[PDB]
Amino acid sequence: HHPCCSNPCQNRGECMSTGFDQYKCDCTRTGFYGENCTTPEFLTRIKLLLKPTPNTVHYILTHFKGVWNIVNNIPFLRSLIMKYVLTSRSYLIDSPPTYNVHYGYKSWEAFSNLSYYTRALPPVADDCPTPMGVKGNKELPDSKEVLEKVLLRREFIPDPQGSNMMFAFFAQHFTHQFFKTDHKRGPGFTRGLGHGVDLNHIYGETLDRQHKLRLFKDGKLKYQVIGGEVYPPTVKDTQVEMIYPPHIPENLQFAVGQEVFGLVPGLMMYATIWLREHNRVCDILKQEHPEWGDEQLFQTSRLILIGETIKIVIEDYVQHLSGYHFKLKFDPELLFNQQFQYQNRIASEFNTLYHWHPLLPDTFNIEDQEYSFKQFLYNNSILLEHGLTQFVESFTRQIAGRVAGGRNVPIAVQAVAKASIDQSREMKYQSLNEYRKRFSLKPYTSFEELTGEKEMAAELKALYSDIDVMELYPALLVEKPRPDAIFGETMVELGAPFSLKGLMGNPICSPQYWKPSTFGGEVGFKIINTASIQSLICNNVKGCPFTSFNV
Amino acid sequence: HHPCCSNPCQNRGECMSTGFDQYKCDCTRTGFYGENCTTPEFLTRIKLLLKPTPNTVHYILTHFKGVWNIVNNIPFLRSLIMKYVLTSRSYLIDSPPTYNVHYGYKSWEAFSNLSYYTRALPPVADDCPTPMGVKGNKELPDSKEVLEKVLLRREFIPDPQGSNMMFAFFAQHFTHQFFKTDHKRGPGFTRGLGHGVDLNHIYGETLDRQHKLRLFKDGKLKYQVIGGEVYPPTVKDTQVEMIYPPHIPENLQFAVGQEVFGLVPGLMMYATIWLREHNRVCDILKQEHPEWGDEQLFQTSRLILIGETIKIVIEDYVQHLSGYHFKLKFDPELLFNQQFQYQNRIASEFNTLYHWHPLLPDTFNIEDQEYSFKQFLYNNSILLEHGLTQFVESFTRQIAGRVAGGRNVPIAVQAVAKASIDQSREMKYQSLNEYRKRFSLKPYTSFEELTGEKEMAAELKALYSDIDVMELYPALLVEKPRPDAIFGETMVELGAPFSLKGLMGNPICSPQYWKPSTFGGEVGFKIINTASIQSLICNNVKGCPFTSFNV
Numbered sequence A, B: 001h002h003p004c005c006s007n008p009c010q011n012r013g014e015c016m017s018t019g020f021d022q023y024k025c026d027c028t029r030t031g032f033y034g035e036n037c038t039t040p041e042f043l044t045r046i047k048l049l050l051k052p053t054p055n056t057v058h059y060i061l062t063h064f065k066g067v068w069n070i071v072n073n074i075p076f077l078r079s080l081i082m083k084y085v086l087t088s089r090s091y092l093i094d095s096p097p098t099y100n101v102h103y104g105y106k107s108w109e110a111f112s113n114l115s116y117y118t119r120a121l122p123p124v125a126d127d128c129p130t131p132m133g134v135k136g137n138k139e140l141p142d143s144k145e146v147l148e149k150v151l152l153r154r155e156f157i158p159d160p161q162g163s164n165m166m167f168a169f170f171a172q173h174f175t176h177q178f179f180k181t182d183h184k185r186g187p188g189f190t191r192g193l194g195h196g197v198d199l200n201h202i203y204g205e206t207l208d209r210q211h212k213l214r215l216f217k218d219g220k221l222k223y224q225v226i227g228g229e230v231y232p233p234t235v236k237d238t239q240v241e242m243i244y245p246p247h248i249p250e251n252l253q254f255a256v257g258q259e260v261f262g263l264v265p266g267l268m269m270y271a272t273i274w275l276r277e278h279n280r281v282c283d284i285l286k287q288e289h290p291e292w293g294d295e296q297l298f299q300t301s302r303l304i305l306i307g308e309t310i311k312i313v314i315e316d317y318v319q320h321l322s323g324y325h326f327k328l329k330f331d332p333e334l335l336f337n338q339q340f341q342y343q344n345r346i347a348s349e350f351n352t353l354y355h356w357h358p359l360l361p362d363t364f365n366i367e368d369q370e371y372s373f374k375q376f377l378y379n380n381s382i383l384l385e386h387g388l389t390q391f392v393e394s395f396t397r398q399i400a401g402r403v404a405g406g407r408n409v410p411i412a413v414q415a416v417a418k419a420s421i422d423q424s425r426e427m428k429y430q431s432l433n434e435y436r437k438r439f440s441l442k443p444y445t446s447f448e449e450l451t452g453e454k455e456m457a458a459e460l461k462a463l464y465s466d467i468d469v470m471e472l473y474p475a476l477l478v479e480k481p482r483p484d485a486i487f488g489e490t491m492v493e494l495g496a497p498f499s500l501k502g503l504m505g506n507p508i509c510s511p512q513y514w515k516p517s518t519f520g521g522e523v524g525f526k527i528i529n530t531a532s533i534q535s536l537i538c539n540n541v542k543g544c545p546f547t548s549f550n551v
């Protein structure tokens, strides 16, 4: 079997087999040397003694309101802090990308084939003695048992940060432009070849789909008016394929950019908001540019909406998640004096960690209805009976579930949580502790240390034996969360790098693009640079309801 | 008609229409301001005063042989010079890319659709009063007339730099991995979606083709043995599509990575050399790695060959072209402390300028045969009749034609030269002088100044009227060349940026890839870092003949 199964190489050094039973580590630019890249260079030891731990930096950012209010208001100083956040996170990601499910060594196939999700760590080799490498038993614990003992929800657990349903559905809507697993092929594959924020969930992945949804007048997307209100067009009308079950009335089969968004009214809400937003921007642009044709109006709006999305994600969405008193900034300019790759590749592990189903409540509370999952799923008529305004008002009020901390995955979606484990396993994911090391974190030394608690840790011990064979997905959902927070440490420390690179790594953030001319002048550039979750809802939802990502 | 037709914005500022008859320049980061980006900031004026002209820098590098021998031998100092060469050229290229034949403004379509060649300058708008913008006549001179008066060859003109046929065919073979125009679609489109040095002309563009050419044993490519010598397999044996005319014997229908390489024995020679090289490297790797399977052997050899190719292109091929006494270096490490994008996109204008047909001789002299074009094209039996060794020996001896300076396109390929003009026109190429400005060069003020000569200038004047409507392609092939050089100034000053970005912009040059482990250890890394045109021929051609890029 493979020499590198034990994952002997430390500190991001590369393991390469040298014989049938021997291996060599490659310690190039790791700042370490010796057989396993475990001995630090001199300047490395100074830099490690100094560099503070992530839980420390987190505390700092979530305390001392006073000091931050000073910082938040000195532009130079805020820019500098944001610049540190962006760069330190960034250089934790391989870019251009390296590994995938089929390639544990770098290769032209792995690089050039955009069908694969990339991989943060190589897969465990097809022939290691144990699933996780060398440690633990011949088989991993049964996945249903892992699910039931520590993932499934007993009483619903509210998010202490107060994330609402507006947040949850925004998260789902947003991430599903670049988490589009190609199930024909397998879990390691993707239909999202844009590999990032290209708004293909609004505009469509292929050109054939885009052209089927476009109106071809003033840049606008096709739509329909029902009860005086703007909604997406139908499958029948556009010829755009959508996943709907047979029993659905043809006029409630809305056709949007992403074929799965019919499944959930929460998604279809955002689909509609974003369709309205596009056409609003075409309207603004048609006024500033009477000379432009349909094509440029469409193209330009899309770039404006990309910018808006990135802005809202950073300054509202990520902001809300962070819990920081520091105010994050979307300013491409902060990277212009930096080594940064304006490219992205969606990593499988990023997809895994973003399975935030604990957010989902037991029932959906719109107006004074309470809808079971069975009631909610597919029922686009709920979105019409109540209308967008009541949706926004109710979803802003209803609280989401806590993700970390264990035992909060809704029973209605248990099959989904199971599949995340089973697919982790098919894709030969490395262990929790390997990922922690990969992103510069002390490996958990015991289950009690991981959960911060005795009861679930005991259950996990009798399922896994060794903390070092604990799997990544279940770990994320049971981890002791930061104090009064939604996530544990691993979730943030893996997630933030992928997230920021997904956002900042967009071509529109590049110097040659980040100019007002790209967005049709001062006006367009201004739309992007003052966008917010609130302005998005306000401009496009009748009555301009107040919204935020928290109750 | 479009406000921006005059190309009013200077110094890389972006023109955007603002009404039906008005426009606005965007001078962001140009270092200039004012209505047309014509007035320099203070620090700009200092930097422009100081910065020496390209003809000056060229002279320096091609004289003072003594001084350079000192430089060539102080590693620190050579590294510093090479670093300047790489960065100054690089920041002339839009990366991530911007315009294409269909998009004169930035757009997601332009960015994300890999089917288009990118564009260094936007196309002239579909509705301008004149083909070149506003200046010149309603029609451009007849392309057949431009060809005949100043492009077609009278007396063959030898290249004063002494480039041989080994150079010419290397150029053709190399560039044809990324100049693969998709003629079904149109001149602005490409079949080479790798957009750079991915060796698809050896391994094939799609995975189907690759799998059809692979042996699946020890990493090797399929081959046949004829007269004791290794040659490519056949179309019949592999099922790999190739462009051969019907009359060709099935056993001389060799199947290589790139479908057009049957056309010309010169190409089939390199095809065979590179196939031999791949298999050689599999052999070396199999010895260093008895534990590796077929897949990793193949994959790793490919990476080694990408490195070899890049090395040979920089240190031999570009070296020979340059005429420099300074010795260029392929060292990815020189870019690690720099802002550099590890991505490439083949520009259309890069394709246009590389149509170096003047290189071709009137007849092909192999051993003591002289072959007409009619005799040469398609005759793969010539390559067997003489064998690779005699091919290398004869091609190394036979001198190529001068490219710049006018009147040196072989009559046999006149249709090709015409199409380069006609397609420049279909793709709405901007004028010569616009491209000179785009790459930081004084616009030519007269034809006499362009050609350095009176006779052709007179002919051109009576064809174009205004120097400012002179087309890019014909200009390249008539330009006054640098003294005793193959090319004129424009050719180098446009080409070099595209070239270096094509080479350095490869993923294997990125810090995460540029490690010995990527190439299977010290041995593989060493193959790459000591590769040359000689060693390539020596290792793979019977008898190890001496070769170089010049007679």
Ligand code: HEM
Pocket: A168, A169, A171, A172, A175, A179, A180, A181, A264, A351, A354, A355, A356, A357, A359, A360, A377, A413, A416, A419, A420
């Ligand atoms: C109540 C609404 C929801 C339902 C019915 C639902 C159900 C599902 C189902 C059936 C899958 C199948 C894909 C797989 O097997 O991996 C899936 C995938 C996924 N879900 Fe959800 N989920 C919901 C909400 C959410 C939310 C709020 C998030 C938060 C971000 C989320 C994140 C994800 C992600 C990242 C995937 C991966 C699928 C892919 O890669 O295409 N889901 N969900």
Ligand code: HEM
Pocket: B168, B169, B171, B172, B175, B179, B180, B181, B264, B266, B351, B354, B355, B356, B357, B359, B360, B377, B413, B416, B419
């Ligand atoms: C063996 C002699 C050669 C012949 C018969 C030949 C023939 C051709 C032909 C028929 C085309 C297609 C023209 C079109 O677009 O319709 C072409 C394109 C081209 N040629 Fe040549 N050529 C020869 C040598 C060379 C050499 C020595 C170079 C050196 C760089 C070269 C560079 C190119 C390039 C860059 C293209 C563009 C092809 C594309 O866009 O895919 N050729 N050649």
Ligand SMILES: *[C@@H]1O[C@H](CO)[C@@H](O[C@@H]2O[C@H](CO)[C@@H](O[C@@H]3O[C@H](CO)[C@@H](O)[C@H](O)[C@@H]3O)[C@H](O)[C@H]2NC(C)=O)[C@H](O)[C@H]1NC(C)=O
Pocket: A206, A207, A208, B113, B114, B115, B116, B185
């Ligand atoms: C890359 O951009 C190119 C060039 O625009 C895209 O090619 C184009 O694809 C369309 C639609 O898929 C072609 O077909 C035309 O549309 C209708 C659809 O109802 C179809 O039935 C007809 O056959 C019709 O001709 C269009 O001609 C084609 N343009 C070409 C070949 O020049 C290509 O799809 C883009 N790639 C991606 C990934 O978007």
Ligand SMILES: *[C@@H]1O[C@H](CO)[C@@H](O[C@@H]2O[C@H](CO)[C@@H](O)[C@H](O)[C@H]2NC(C)=O)[C@H](O)[C@H]1NC(C)=O
Pocket: A113, A114, A115, A116, A185, B206, B207, B208
């Ligand atoms: C990306 O990789 C996939 C998977 O390796 C390639 O798909 C394979 O293609 C071969 C030959 O066409 C088939 O025999 C396999 O069945 C395919 N795997 C599948 C369908 O899952 C795919 O071709 C590669 N991408 C590109 C752009 O070439």
Ligand SMILES: *[C@@H]1O[C@H](CO)[C@@H](O[C@H]2O[C@H](CO)[C@@H](O)[C@H](O)[C@H]2NC(C)=O)[C@H](O)[C@H]1NC(C)=O
Pocket: A006, A008, A035, A036, A038
């Ligand atoms: C580097 O890591 C390797 C592989 O994990 C270490 O392997 C050794 O440690 C085992 C655990 O006690 C020994 O009992 C094994 O015999 C031994 N395995 C070998 C040599 O393959 C190794 O000690 C490490 N080396 C250094 C210098 O730290």
Ligand SMILES: *[C@@H]1O[C@H](CO)[C@@H](O[C@H]2O[C@H](CO)[C@@H](O)[C@H](O)[C@H]2NC(C)=O)[C@H](O)[C@H]1NC(C)=O
Pocket: B006, B007, B008, B035, B036
């Ligand atoms: C910027 O460029 C434009 C055109 O290139 C200039 O426009 C005018 O130039 C002349 C001098 O004012 C006029 O007589 C022309 O009518 C007009 N040219 C065209 C083609 O419309 C403009 O002046 C320039 N700006 C500055 C500050 O010089």
Ligand SMILES: CS(=O)(=O)Nc1ccc([N+](=O)[O-])cc1OC1CCCCC1
Pocket: A085, A089, A318, A321, A322, A323, A487, A491, A492, A495, A496, A497, A499, A500
């Ligand atoms: C660059 S960042 O500011 O450090 N991102 C980030 C910081 C802190 C938290 N958090 O919940 O403590 C979440 C974050 O966002 C990512 C967004 C994607 C999911 C994972 C966390």
Ligand SMILES: CS(=O)(=O)Nc1ccc([N+](=O)[O-])cc1OC1CCCCC1
Pocket: B085, B089, B318, B321, B322, B323, B328, B485, B486, B487, B491, B492, B493, B494, B495, B496, B497, B499, B500
């Ligand atoms: C980066 S570089 O070293 O400055 N390139 C370069 C310098 C000088 C010459 N030349 O002909 O004197 C050719 C060059 O290469 C390119 C090769 C492709 C065509 C254009 C010139």
Ligand SMILES: CCCCCCCCO[C@@H]1O[C@H](CO)[C@@H](O)[C@H](O)[C@H]1O
Pocket: A148, A149, A150, A152, A153, A154, A455, A459
């Ligand atoms: C509602 C989801 C639970 C379904 C049964 C899961 C199988 C048993 O799960 C058990 O739950 C008990 C109470 O939470 C705990 O005391 C035990 O640690 C746990 O093993």
Ligand SMILES: *[C@@H]1O[C@H](CO)[C@@H](O)[C@H](O)[C@H]1NC(C)=O
Pocket: A374, A375, A376, A379, A380, A381, A382, A385
């Ligand atoms: C769809 O929602 C409506 C409310 O408009 C509800 O009456 C109905 O039960 C739902 N359909 C299903 C199948 O649950």
Ligand SMILES: *[C@@H]1O[C@H](CO)[C@@H](O)[C@H](O)[C@H]1NC(C)=O
Pocket: B375, B378, B379, B381, B382, B385
């Ligand atoms: C190929 O070369 C041979 C060399 O003897 C010559 O007779 C002829 O011109 C060529 N023939 C064909 C069919 O290509």
